A paper describes a structure:
The Lon protease is a AAA+ protein found in prokaryotes, archaea, and eukaryotic organelles. Lon is involved in cellular protein homeostasis by degrading damaged or misfolded abnormal proteins, which prevents these unwanted protein species from forming toxic aggregates. Lon is known to form a homohexamer; each protomer is composed of multiple domains, including an N-terminal substrate-binding globular domain (NGD), a long-helix domain (LH), a three-helix bundle (3H), a AAA+ ATPase module, and a protease domain. We show here, using cryo-electron microscopy (cryo-EM), that the activation process of the Lon AAA+ protease may involve a pentameric assembly and a substrate-dependent incorporation of the sixth protomer to form the substrate-pore-loop contacts seen in the translocating state.
Using a fluorescence polarization (FP) assay, we found that MtaLon-Y224S, which carries a mutation of the entry-gate residue Tyr224 to Ser19, does not interact with fluorescein isothiocyanate (FITC)-labeled casein. We conducted cryo-EM analysis on MtaLon-Y224S incubated with 5 mM of ATPγS (MtaLon-Y224S:ATPγS). Unexpectedly, both MtaLon-Y224S:ATPγS and wild-type MtaLon, whether with ADP or lacking nucleotide, predominantly formed left-handed spiral pentamers or spiral hexamers, rather than closed-ring hexamers. The substrate-free hexameric form also adopts a left-handed spiral structure. It is composed of the tethered pentamer and an additional Ac-protomer, Ac6*, which binds next to the protomer Ob1 and occupies the lowermost position of the spiral.
Residue numbers in the entry:
A (entry chain C): 74 to 145
B (entry chain F): 2 to 217
C (entry chain B): 218 to 577
D (entry chain C): 218 to 433
The structure:
Amino acid sequence: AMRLPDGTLQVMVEARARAQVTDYIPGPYLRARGEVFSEIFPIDEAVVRVLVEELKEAFEKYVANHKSLRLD
Amino acid sequence: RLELPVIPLRNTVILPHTTTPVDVGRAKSKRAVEEAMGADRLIFLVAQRDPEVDDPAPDDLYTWGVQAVVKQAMRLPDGTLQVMVEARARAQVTDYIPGPYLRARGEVFSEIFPIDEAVVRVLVEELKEAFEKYVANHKSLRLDRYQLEAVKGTSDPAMLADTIAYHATWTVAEKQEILELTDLEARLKKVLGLLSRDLERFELDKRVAQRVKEQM
Amino acid sequence: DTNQRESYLREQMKAIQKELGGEDGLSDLEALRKKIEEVGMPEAVKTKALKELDRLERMQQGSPEATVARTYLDWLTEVPWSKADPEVLDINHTRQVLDEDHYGLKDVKERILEYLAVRQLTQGLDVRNKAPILVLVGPPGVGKTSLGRSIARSMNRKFHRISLGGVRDEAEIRGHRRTYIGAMPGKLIHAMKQVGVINPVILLDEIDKMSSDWRGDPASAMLEVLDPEQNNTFTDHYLDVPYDLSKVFFITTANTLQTIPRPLLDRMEVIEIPGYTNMEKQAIARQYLWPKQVRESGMEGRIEVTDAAILRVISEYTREAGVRGLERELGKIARKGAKFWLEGAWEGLRTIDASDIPTY
Amino acid sequence: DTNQRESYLREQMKAIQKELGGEDGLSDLEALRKKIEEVGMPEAVKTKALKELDRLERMQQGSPEATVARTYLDWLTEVPWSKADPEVLDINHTRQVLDEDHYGLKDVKERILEYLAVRQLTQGLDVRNKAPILVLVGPPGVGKTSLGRSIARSMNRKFHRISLGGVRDEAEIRGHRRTYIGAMPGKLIHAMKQVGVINPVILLDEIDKMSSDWRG
Ligand SMILES: Nc1ncnc2c1ncn2[C@@H]1O[C@H](COP(=O)(O)OP(=O)(O)OP(O)(O)=S)[C@@H](O)[C@H]1O
C-alpha cells in the first residue's frame, strides 16, 4: 500500500474467501464477524474443466462481438 | 502547431496523408503562404466553409486545423500558387484570430492509437476490401484507379483511413463529422456506412436503369 | 427538344417506377392484380377481374370510366373470398352464454337453442338446408340486437347488423350497373365488406319496414338472399358473378308479423320476443343496466340507488315496454349523480333513496 | 437506407420535375415531399406518403393521378396529426362562461353541466364516450351557436361551423379515392384541415333539414 498525494489511500489486494456476518458490532469504525475461509474446492474436475473451456470460448465470443465498443 | 499561418482550403477539406493539390489564389492567403515558408515548411491548414468568401474571414473557418509538411512548393505566374502538401493529422482550433492574413493556434495531433488493435487491423482490411469493391464497381460514376493505387502499402491505419476517406466523393459535412471523430475505429465505421449508402444508391441507379428499358 | 426531352421525361416518370415508393402498388394496379391472385376467388370472378383489369391500364387520366373500373376492381378484391372463421360445434356454450349475460330471456332462449342445435346437426354444414333462418319479432328495445350479438359470441364468429328499414328500392340492395363516378353496390355488400370474413353472423334489422314504389322492388333481392338454396347464387347489379352466401348466417329482426312481404314470410321460424316484467327489469337494472351506467359515466363504487327507487323509476319514468327508456332514465340519474358529485363530494359513497328522486 | 434512397429519388426527381411537360403538378411533388419522409407525423402519414410516391410521376390535364397525389398529400399533412390544443378541464369555468356570454334561461345550463360532469369522469386509461351527443332543438334565431362557441371557449377549443342542411350524398361528406383531381373531400375533413389541432368542438346545424335526393 501507499499514500496518494491528493489524499487517497491506495492498496493492492487479492481477496481470500467469502464469509457470513453473524452479528454487527456498532461503529464507526465498522467491524465484521465471520469465518477465515468458507470456499468450496472443485470436485469431479472433468465437468469443471469443460465448464472452464466453455466459459473461455464464450468470453472470447463476447470480446469478439465488439466493433466500436472495444475492450482490453 | 501554434500561431502558424492559416490557408483556407479550396471547396473541400483536405484530409491528412494524401498527395493533394492546394490552390492559393487570393492575396490574403498568399501572404500567409509567404509567412508559412518562414515556419519550416509547416502550415496549420484551417479550412473555410463551402461558400468561399473572396477574403478569408475569422468566423467562416472550421474547428479542425491540419498540420502539413510541404514536400515541394512550386509557384505559378497565372495567379494561383499550387502547393504540394502532404499533411500529417488533424488538430483542434481553440479560437480564431482575425486578419487578413488569418492566424489560428492548435495543439498536438488528434490521431490516437487505442487498445484492441486486432479489431483495428480487421476493420482496416474490411474497409480496404469494401473500398476496393466501391472503386471497382463505380466505373460508371467516375472513380479513379490512381486513388486505388495510392492506398496500397500503408504502415499506419490512419494512412489508409484518411486516404480512403479522401478518395471517395461525398459532402463536406460528413468529412467534418469524420474529422470530429478522433477514434481509430469510429472513422472506419463511418466510412464503411457511407460506402454502403453510395453503393445502395448506385444499385438504385441500376434499378431505375432496368425500368428504363422496361418502360421504353 | 420540346418533343424528345418531354418523351425522356415520360421515360423518367415510368422508368423510376417510384422505386422504393413504387415497391407498393408496383406502378399503379400491378399490386391489385397481385391481390386478385392472392385472394382465393371463384373462377368466374377471376375471369371478370382479369378481363376488366385488361380494361384498366388504359390511360386513366381523361377517363373516369377507368376510375370506376378500378373502383369495381377494388370492390372485387376487397370483398372477402375464402376467408373463414372458427366456429363452435356445441350447443352447451350457447347455453352458458344466454344463461350468463342476458338473464335467461325468460324461457325463449331454449327455443333459440333448438334452432342452433338443429343447425349444427345438419351434416357437413352443407349448402342445402331447406330451412328457416330465425326471424325475431318484438316491440323495440328488448335486447334482440344484443341477443344476436350474444348468439354470435357463443358462435365465436363476428356479429354484424344493418338497419335495412326505410329503403325505397332495389338500387341499394343490389346496387346499380356502373356508369359514372359514385357507383355503389347494395348495402349487404357494404356490410360484408366491413366484415372481413366470408362466414359472418349477419342480423337483418327491419325487413318489415322496407318501402316500395320506384327503381325496382328490393323484395326480389331479399328473397334472392333469403333462401339458402338461392343466396348461394345471389348476383348483383354493381357486381356480376353470383356471390356464395351459404356459410353466412342470417339472423333477422322485424317488428310486425303482418307487414313483412309474402315471399319473405314463408320458410321462416317465427319467434315472438317477450318483454321482461317490471320486477324482471328491476333485476335487469340491478346487474346489467345501472352498473353499465355506472361503468360508462365513471362512478364505480361512488354511487348507489335503492331498488325500491328503481321501482319508482320504472313505475314513474318509463312506460315503454322495452328497456331503452329505463336506460335513458338511469343515464339521466348517472349524469345528475356526476353533477352532484362534482359539486363537491360530500360522501365517499352516495346514497340514493326513494325520496330525493325529483332532485336527481 | 430506405429513407436515404427515397431521398435520392427526391433529389433526382426534383432535378427532373423542373422542366416537365406535365405542368399542372407544378413540379410540387418533390416540393411537397419535404413532408412525405422528412415529416414529423406518424407512420400512417409515412405509409400513405410512400404510396403517394407511387401516386407521383404521372401527368395531368383532365383526371391527373399526380395532382391528386399532391392534393391528397396536403390534405393528410395539413390535417393535424397528434397535435392537440391544451383544453382546460373545468366546470365552474363554464358556469362563468355561460354567465358572461348569455342571459340564459338557466335550464339548459344545467344540462350541459350534466354532460360535462360526465366528461370530467372520462376513465379507462383513455377518453371513450358511449354517451349522447347533445341535440339542440328550438328556433333558429335563438343563440344556439353562441351557446356552442361559449362551450368551446370554456374548453379552450376551436369552434367551427359546418352545416348539414346542405349535404345530399356521401360525396360532400365522404371522399373519393385519390386518383383524380375534381374529387373533393368532405365537410368534416374540410373543417379538420381548417384547424391545426386534432381536437375541435364541432357544432352541427340543422340536422333535420337533410334529405336523400340522389341514390344514397
Ligand atoms: N333480457 C333483456 N331484455 C331486455 N333488455 C335487456 C336484457 N338484457 C339486457 N338488456 C339491456 O338491453 C339494452 C340494449 O338492448 P335493448 O335496448 O333491450 O334492445 P336492443 O337489442 O338494443 O335493440 P332491439 O331489442 O333489437 S329493438 C342494454 O342496456 C342491456 O343492458
